[PDB]
From Swiss-Prot, chain A:
Function: Could be part of the type IV piliation system (T4P). May contribute at the cohesion between the S-layer and the outer membrane by forming oligomers. Could also be the main channel through which trafficking is managed.
Entry similarity comment: Belongs to the bacterial secretin family.
Record-given protein name: Probable type IV piliation system protein DR_0774
Organism: Deinococcus radiodurans (strain ATCC 13939 / DSM 20539 / JCM 16871 / CCUG 27074 / LMG 4051 / NBRC 15346 / NCIMB 9279 / VKM B-1422 / R1)
UniProt subcellular location: Cell envelope
Amino acid sequence: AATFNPTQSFLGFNIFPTLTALETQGLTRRVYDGNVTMQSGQRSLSATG
Amino acid sequence: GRVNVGVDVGDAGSEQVATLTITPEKCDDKGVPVTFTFTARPGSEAVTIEGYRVLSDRLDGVERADPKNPVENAKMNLYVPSGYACEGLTAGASCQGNESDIRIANGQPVQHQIYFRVVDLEFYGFSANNVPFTRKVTGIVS
Amino acid sequence: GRVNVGVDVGDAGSEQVATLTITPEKCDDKGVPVTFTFTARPGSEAVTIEGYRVLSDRLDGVERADPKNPVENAKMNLYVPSGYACEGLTAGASCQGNESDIRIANGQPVQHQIYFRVVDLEFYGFSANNVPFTRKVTGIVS
Amino acid sequence: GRVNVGVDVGDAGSEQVATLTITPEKCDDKGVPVTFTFTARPGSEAVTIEGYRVLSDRLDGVERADPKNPVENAKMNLYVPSGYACEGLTAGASCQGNESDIRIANGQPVQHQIYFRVVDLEFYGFSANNVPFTRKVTGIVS
Amino acid sequence: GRVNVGVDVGDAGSEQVATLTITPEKCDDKGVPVTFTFTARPGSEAVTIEGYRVLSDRLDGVERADPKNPVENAKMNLYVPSGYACEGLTAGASCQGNESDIRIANGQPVQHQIYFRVVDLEFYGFSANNVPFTRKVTGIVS
Amino acid sequence: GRVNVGVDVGDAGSEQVATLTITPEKCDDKGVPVTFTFTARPGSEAVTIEGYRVLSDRLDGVERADPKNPVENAKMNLYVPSGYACEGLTAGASCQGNESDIRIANGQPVQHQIYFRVVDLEFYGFSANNVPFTRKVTGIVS
């Protein structure tokens, strides 16, 4: 975005810089180990309240 | 870019009165500055006046000047606003030039005094783009 | 980075009047400072003036100066604002330079007085980036 | 950490006038302090001035000083603010340094008077980190 | 715990003027206190000054003191605030020290007058933890 | 329980001036109290002063006292507040001691005048727990 002004004139050179830098990492683990003991011809249970 | 500034001299009340062989005493027995106004024309840049050079000095008609070596002055920091008009203009400033409201008008008047014979001044300075400027004000009396 | 400051000296009322062989008595029988104004040009840095050196002293035309050893002064702490304009600017401060509103304008005028013959001063100091500065004000009278 | 304080001396009105062989009587027949101003430069620490040492005394040009044993003074408790600017700053205090609004500016001016020949002072003290400080104000007149 | 208090003496207007062989009469024919200011440095405790000892008295240069038996005074109850700053601080009090707002600043100034030759005082007292304190103010004139 | 009260004597303006062999007349021809301030130290109890005993009287250096039988006074009912600070404290009272806001501070100053040579007083009284109290104010002049 450059402009020109024919009515004024700046003194010298100015640069006015600005820097920005960012880095990031993440790591989520979530583990489950479930046992159940059961029988061969096991049926469901109907309680359900 | 153009520079166009005009000046109103107003050289009255500039000579000291002494030709009174009479007196303000009982009965003729016992008791025997110029304001320069600079204004910028419409469409002109801003300019700052730094000094003046006296190119011609004539007391009663004698050129006591030596134009090879004028009498320079460097005692002026006088700002002449641009010669535009807008909304955000302060008292002694100039418009940016891109207000979308800006007109070309006469600049704000700025004054200077030189207490002083007819001399021919020449003010100098630089514009808002830093280029040299000269303005002759020939003819001022006493 | 650039420094650009101008000065309006105004050396009127600087010489003491004594050439009166006449008198303010009955009938000619019995009874036989300069204001420097510094202003920073648009686009300039701020600067602080520390003192001045008299590079040329001439009473009635005699160079009584010895330019090998000028007369230094080191008794000034005078701040000349930057020469910009913004919204948060106080009375005697300078803009930061990143206001997104900032313009280039003439700085606030700051004055100094030296009660004093034509002498050629040279003010010195340092800018806002701490670099040496010199400004010649040659030509001041009495 | 740096200390940078400047002083405006202001030597006028410091010598008593007595060279009047004439008089304020009928007709020449019968009747035969310096304000130091300390201000801290932008980016400087705060400092407290404890006293001064006269390193060179010269009345009409005679070194009546004996620089082996200067004339110490230890009767000053003068605080020079840091030389920053913020929102919560009181009259005679210094910014903490972590305001997220803080700028580098000129500190508040603090004055001292010594009613006094050209002497060469040297103020001393300690900064906000308690380190010794010296500041020469050479050249003061009468 | 540390104690650090500084004093501004200001010993002007302390000697009575009598060396006038002339007079305020027709024509030379017929008619032939110091303010101590104590302030506490940042980070210091509060302290109360109880009195002073004159360790050295010299009128025109003669040690009329007998330092074996100084001249004690025990007629002072002067409180020097801590040297911090907070929100609930009253006029002549000290901060508790745990305000979560507390800074280290210069304490409130408290003054004392001794109408008095160069003497070398030494104030004494106790801090806010009730420990002895001494502060030499050597060099005061007349 | 502890009692700790301090006193500022201020014995200036206490001697009548009569050594004027000269006069306030035409030309040397024809015409040939101390304010005790008691304040309680932080953490102290309240105390009431009942009177004083003059343990040593010395006019120009002669012990005209007879310390076997001092000169007792019993005409004082002077209350010295506790030396704490709270919210409900009135002008001349003491805090209860269980305000949950209470601090240790300097008590309110209470004054007494004895228009009076160097005498050595000793005030006495009882604390808020009704125990005897003594406080020597040795050294007061005229």
